[PDB]
């Protein structure tokens, strides 16, 4: 079996905002690394572009 000696190997905490997480870690005395939230960028979609008269976007199949 898989053995461990780490008592915190399973602990996961959930926070509303990064500030709450940072405050919790600071008051508990843990060194922390924060990563900014990554969101998908807004993309311009257009169905008609699939059938461009002169553009490269035209689909070869559908």
């Amino acid at each position: 079996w898989s053995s461990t000696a780490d008592p915190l190997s399973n602990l996961v905490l959930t926070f509303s905002t990064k500030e709450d997480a940072v405050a919790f870690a600071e008051k508990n005395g843990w060194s922390f690394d924060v990563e900014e939230r990554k969101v998908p960028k807004p993309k311009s979609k257009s169905y008609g572009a699939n059938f461009s008269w002169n553009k490269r976007t035209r689909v070869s199949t559908k």
Binding site: Y47, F51, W53
Partner: protein
């Protein structure tokens, strides 16, 4: 006096398709003699606005089956040029079971279609006309090409097309056995060398069509009448049929009739008069009639109770819960298996789905299996309502209107012939237990 009430007796002086039977020469010399290619230059010189107005005044509705008003639809390409060429596509697929009007127009009056292409392209500002014809219509396509050749030689199309100053080309592209390619967007895709799979709308073809250019898709019958409407006027064309149901119409009467045929008739003719006059009535008498599909397989069937008093136009048949469709009357007498006919239509639709979208691709095959079990009686009554709901899920949830045409005949059969289904199930249970 205006507002006629008894439509359905018009003489040959008011029929557009005078060579419907092909008795007369189908060649250009014959076309000209009948009244074709007359004052084309004058019509072209009147301009697109004048041409568009004539279509609008006539009230002409699309003869391909949907009945969308033709003038408004054609006016969608009246925009100024944006650098892209403009095209007119003629829908000559004619895949609807029970329908043979476009075949006759193509084989026996091709110059009417060529002139209609020229006038429609002038109205839309189009550059050339692509005529997408059924692949199985080899001889019809060859006659069409001969007609286009003799029109090119006589200077009726091509460069300047007339003493007009307008350049117009007419191309014939043949399909390869696909009923779905009758749909306008699927037709456009098949012209561009792809599978005949319909597009989503928007965009509409007037914005992004064939080769990505503004396009207008029109039914063969819709285009052929275009020059006769221009010459005689929209007011004359309108003087036939009820309000919002103007003009004449080709009807294909087939099935259990004494003389199956095709005939031009006024729009709002009653169904009974049309069947008993031109088709020779139902074999076994009018009281032998069981059901009628008034507009090709895509329309729900109606029983004899409705058939005796319904008019053959868009709004009248909509009020009868069926629809005019392609004006392809299929008659079934009291001697046929009404469930088997609908099952065969559902099998046709299962074999004709393109498979692109989920509701059609899965549910039409599902409905085919259910209907094949219904024919034998394998099912239970609780499935009939179930089948109804399956159709409802399919209808209005698909890209293409083939799903509607698959779900409507089943709804018609269930709406009007449920007791036959239930007694078939009871019989199968009785001799099987």
């Amino acid at each position: 006096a205006p507002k006629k009430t008894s439509f359905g007796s018009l003489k040959d002086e008011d029929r557009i398709f005078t060579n419907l039977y092909g008795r007369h020469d189908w060649r250009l010399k014959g076309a000209q003699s009948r009244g074709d290619w007359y004052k084309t230059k004058e019509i072209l010189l009147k301009g697109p606005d004048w041409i568009l107005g004539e279509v609008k005044t006539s009230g002409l509705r699309g003869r391909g089956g949907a009945g969308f008003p033709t003038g408004l639809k054609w006016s969608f390409m009246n925009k100024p040029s944006d650098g892209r060429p403009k095209y007119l596509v003629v829908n000559a697929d004619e895949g609807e079971p029970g329908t043979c009007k476009d075949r006759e127009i193509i084989r026996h009056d091709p110059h009417k279609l060529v002139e209609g292409c020229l006038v429609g392209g002038r109205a839309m500002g189009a550059r050339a006309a692509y005529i997408y014809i059924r692949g199985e219509f080899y001889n019809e396509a060859s006659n069409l090409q001969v007609a286009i050749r003799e029109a090119y030689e006589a200077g009726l199309i091509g460069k300047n097309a007339c003493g007009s100053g307008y350049d117009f080309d007419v191309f014939v592209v043949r399909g390869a056995g696909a009923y779905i390619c009758g749909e306008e967007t699927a037709l456009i895709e098949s012209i561009e060398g792809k599978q005949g799979k319909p597009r989503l709308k928007p965009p509409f073809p007037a914005d992004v069509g064939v080769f990505g250019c503004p396009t207008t898709v029109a039914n063969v019958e819709t285009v052929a009448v275009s020059p006769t409407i221009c010459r005689r006027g929209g007011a004359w064309f309108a003087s036939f049929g009820r309000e919002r149901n103007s003009g004449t119409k080709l009807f294909n009467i087939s099935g259990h009739v004494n003389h199956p045929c095709t005939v031009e008739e006024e729009m709002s003719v009653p169904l009974k008069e049309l069947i008993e006059k031109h088709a020779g009535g139902v074999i076994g008498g009018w009281d032998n009639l069981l059901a009628v599909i008034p507009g090709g397989s895509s329309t729900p069937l109606i029983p004899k109770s409705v058939c005796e008093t319904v008019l053959m136009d868009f709004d009248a048949l909509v009020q009868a819960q069926t629809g005019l469709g392609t004006a392809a009357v299929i008659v079934m007498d009291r001697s046929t298996d009404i469930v088997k006919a609908i099952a065969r239509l559902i099998e046709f639709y299962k074999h004709e789905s393109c498979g692109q979208c989920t509701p059609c691709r899965e549910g039409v095959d599902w409905m085919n299996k259910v209907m094949a079990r219904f024919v034998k009686g394998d099912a239970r009554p609780a499935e009939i309502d179930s089948l109804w709901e399956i159709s409802k899920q399919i209808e209005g949830h698909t890209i293409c209107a083939l799903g509607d045409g698959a779900a409507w005949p089943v709804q018609g059969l269930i709406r009007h012939f449920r007791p036959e289904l239930e007694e078939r199930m009871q019989q199968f249970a009785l001799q099987h237990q």
